[PDB]
Design a binder for these strands. Structure first.
Lengths: 52, 159, 269, 169
RNA sequence: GGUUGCGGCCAUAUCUACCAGAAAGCACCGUUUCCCGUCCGAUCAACUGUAGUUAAGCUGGUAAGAGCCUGACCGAGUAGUGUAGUGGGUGACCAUACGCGAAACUCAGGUGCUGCAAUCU
RNA sequence: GAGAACAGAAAUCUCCAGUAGAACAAAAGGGUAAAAGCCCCCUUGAUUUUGAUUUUCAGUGUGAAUACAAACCAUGAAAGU
RNA sequence: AAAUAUGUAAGAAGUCCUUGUUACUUAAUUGAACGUGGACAUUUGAAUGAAGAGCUUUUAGUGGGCCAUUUUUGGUAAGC
């Protein structure tokens, strides 16, 4: 009958860990107009640094 | 039965503050938002095209996407036994900048102004914060302030 | 009255309590697309007083508003307009003035020369191919209403013909009917000049000439003949393109004398 | 006195309220298009009544606003059948007044067999000049206290001009 | 210092009742040929700064004021409160030790600051 | 509230006060005054292609929305919607 | 308008400078994001602790709960 007894103890027993973010986050929900130009800028830089 | 809407039990949480009705003032739009700012989420219930859910009120997130008249924030949320990164899009009226990071940033630009100065001076100086330290051996005075006694009051006329 | 009525009373914003600023329209004007991060959103303010016409270009910041360049119509005697300081064609000349002044300040007045000849037609400024894009400036008109053929759109006409890009459509320019759905160049070249104030001059030359001496009292004494108002509006239009720059008027004093006079009148605390 | 403080007239409204729509209502429009010379306007319904024939959103009555000199001469002809004599109860404390008549043909107008026998309500409003800042759009504001038209103003101006002889009771 | 345009903060910016404002600007005002809109050139529309004054608007002072804001050896370390006991009381509730700590009242001060541009005898 | 013939507790009309005390289809709450209310004007963004996110949640389904991109449009003088 | 409870931050995946990319954006050789290259490289920037950190696979039992301080809600009160 929905008693939340012991539930905080269960969730704290193995710890409530952080999602551990990274460098370079995922570009799933970003602006697509920005995303295409970022892809083209990366491809321009990838040859412009290779050719020097 | 029961009810779990999108705005349930948000009576006293979405209403405007006293004498703060009307169209929101135009400084809330000119404040720009880059990708990486630590922003609060305090909603105002005037504009509704983009009101957050009742859980994200008051919480603090990080901007990760910027688009037309709206920004995407990232919030860690506790569910069950772990955190989940809820990303969510919000219109710019519900997003105020947080001065917690911007107090730290000016102190970084200040300790870059004292540490790099004194390390070229020749004294390697301290820069960390320190908590409220205990006091020093102080000789108090007694010149006109005589230490005058006290006696606690009885219960007569108190009744 | 009561004090509980004044306790819970909410005053509006100050420039709405005065009644001057449409805080609704300003909202849509100053918000920009946030992917365009710190780009200013320029506006063309035009405001019509009783005997003076204002034309400014504004940016926007939190610390007030910022004026990019300004233009009045009480300074047109520098180029050669004496009377008709608040005229449809005066607003057209002010629109031709502010365009050239902003483009001369920006360095775009040679690449965007606008239209040298004028013929009375609806056109838009085009992007120069592999060039700097046109200067994009959006209108605003106050609390004053919009209506077809109005005095306000003379400034827009002068701006779009001076060569800065203002978005506009022809369904309010004078001569655009609801039935033809087309502008009339015969009415347009007569409202961008004195072709209707002179058309009133002729129909007061033979209706009651004392009223013609009443309204146009400073006209005929200055010898303002109606048959060359088109040419006197034409003549300073090229000197606008020659010299549009704001040179400052030579003052009589240096603000201390104004302060020393007005402080005795000002009736302090 | 001084310029721009006098109690000049501003408009007069020619109200007629009969209470039913049809031939009598278009005759109520015809008796004002041949009195005021302007295109008249009618009135929609306000609220509930079963005893006046008026139910919601029907044309029921007529009134014409008129400015300029024509309102002044319509008042001046309405007073030479009403003896240039108006009451004191007829005069408001807010700077305007009005008066009733019980026929139009008393005024000097010429009869037509298809008109009718029904009166009229001449209400009039006036102001000191400078009272467009109440009306306008940009930078509005209520006029000052000393400039406000009141009962004493509109009575002691009517005694001077157009010969009140007002029945103070 | 004055005025105007566009403003940021949105009552220290308001409401009231008065009083006063040289220049300049604003405003009221004049006219209905044309664009133009109404029942009505009153709002709106347009022409002309001409016929006329600061009476209004507006700005600035002023008031045994109404508010509003601000600070309290103010209310008071009071009320409510986290914590402990084999503490009391039959109970309601309490007194303790360790801590955090208001508010309405009450008194004292104040009645807009300011950005950009233009203009000023 | 001040007022105007029949005209009134109330027919229409004029003016002063009017922080919403009214309206917004519906339950209660929240929101709104040159509007989101009331009249008028033009309309079909109630459209097409699929994604991402939020809510109840295993972060399944169903419903509901929120912010974009690509077109095609409406409105508007225009910003934008 | 409190007390307990909660969000975030207290740096190296940082601070600042120089100047490349791009089909997005600016009126613009502006701005966005990511970069190259040098400097800050010790107090790598609040306290206390770390008896190691992170990540994956698979599967047993469970999926009938009671008691007490405290807050409280139905009931006319409970070892309800």
């Amino acid at each position: 009958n929905h008693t939340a007894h012991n539930q905080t103890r269960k969730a704290h027993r193995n710890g409530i860990k952080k999602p551990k973010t990274y460098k370079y986050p995922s570009l799933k929900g970003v602006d697509p107009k920005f995303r295409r130009n970022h892809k083209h800028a990366l491809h321009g830089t990838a040859k412009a640094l290779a050719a020097a | 039965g029961k009810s779990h809407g999108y705005r349930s039990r948000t009576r006293y949480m979405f209403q405007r503050d006293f004498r703060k009705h009307g169209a929101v003032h135009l400084s809330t739009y000119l404040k720009v938002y880059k990708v990486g700012d630590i922003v609060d989420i305090k909603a105002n219930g005037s504009i509704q095209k983009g009101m957050p859910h009742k859980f994200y009120q008051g919480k603090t997130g990080v901007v990760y996407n910027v688009t037309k008249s709206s920004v995407g924030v990232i919030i860690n949320k506790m569910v069950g036994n772990r955190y989940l990164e809820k990303r969510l899009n919000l219109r710019v009226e519900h997003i105020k900048h947080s001065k917690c990071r911007q107090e730290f940033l000016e102190r970084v630009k200040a300790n870059a102004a004292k540490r790099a100065e004194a390390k070229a001076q020749g004294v390697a100086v301290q820069l960390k914060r320190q908590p409220a330290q205990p006091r020093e051996s102080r000789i108090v005075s007694t010149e006109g302030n005589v230490p005058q006694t006290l006696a606690p009051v009885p219960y007569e006329t108190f009744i | 009255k009561s004090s509980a009525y004044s306790s819970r009373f909410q005053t509006p914003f100050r420039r709405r309590r005065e009644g001057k600023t449409d805080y609704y329209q300003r909202k849509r004007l100053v918000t920009q697309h946030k992917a365009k991060y710190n780009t200013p959103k320029y506006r063309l303010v035009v405001r019509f007083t009783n005997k003076d016409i204002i034309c400014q270009i504004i940016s926007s910041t939190i610390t007030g508003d910022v004026v990019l360049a300004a233009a009045y119509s009480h300074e047109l005697p520098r180029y050669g307009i004496t009377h008709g300081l608040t005229n449809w064609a005066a607003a057209y000349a002010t629109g031709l003035l502010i365009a050239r002044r902003t483009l001369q300040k920006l360095g775009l007045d040679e690449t965007y020369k606008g239209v040298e000849e004028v013929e009375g037609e609806y056109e838009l400024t085009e992007a120069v191919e592999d060039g700097p894009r046109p200067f994009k400036v959006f209108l605003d008109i106050g609390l004053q209403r919009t209506t077809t053929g109005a005095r306000v759109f003379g400034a827009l006409k002068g701006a779009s013909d001076g060569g800065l890009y203002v978005p506009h459509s022809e369904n309010r320019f004078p001569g655009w009917d609801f039935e033809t759905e087309e502008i009339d160049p015969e009415l347009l070249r007569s409202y961008i000049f004195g072709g209707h104030v002179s058309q009133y001059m002729e129909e007061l030359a033979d209706d009651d000439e004392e009223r013609f001496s009443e309204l146009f009292k400073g006209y005929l004494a200055d010898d303002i003949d109606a048959d060359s108002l088109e040419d006197i509006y034409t003549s300073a239009h090229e000197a606008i393109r020659a010299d549009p720059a704001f040179k400052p008027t030579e003052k009589k004093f240096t603000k201390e004398q104004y302060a020393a006079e007005s402080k005795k009148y000002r009736q302090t605390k | 006195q001084n310029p721009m403080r006098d109690l000049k007239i501003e408009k007069l409204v020619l109200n007629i309220s009969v209470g039913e729509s049809g031939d009598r209502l278009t005759r109520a429009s015809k008796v004002l298009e041949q009195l005021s010379g302007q295109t008249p306007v009618q009135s929609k319904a306000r609220y509930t009544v079963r005893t006046f024939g008026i139910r919601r959103n029907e044309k029921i009555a007529v009134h014409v606003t008129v400015r300029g000199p024509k309102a002044e001469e319509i008042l001046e002809r309405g007073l030479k059948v009403k003896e240039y004599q108006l009451r004191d109860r007829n005069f408001s404390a807010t700077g305007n007044f009005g008066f009733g008549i019980d026929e139009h043909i008393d005024l000097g107008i010429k009869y037509d067999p298809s008109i009718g026998i029904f009166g009229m309500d001449f209400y009039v409003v006036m102001n000191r000049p400078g009272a467009r800042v109440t009306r306008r759009k940009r930078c509005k504001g209520t006029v000052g206290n000393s400039h406000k038209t009141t009962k004493e103003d509109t009575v002691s101006w009517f005694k001077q001009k157009y010969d009140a002889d007002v029945l103070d009771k």
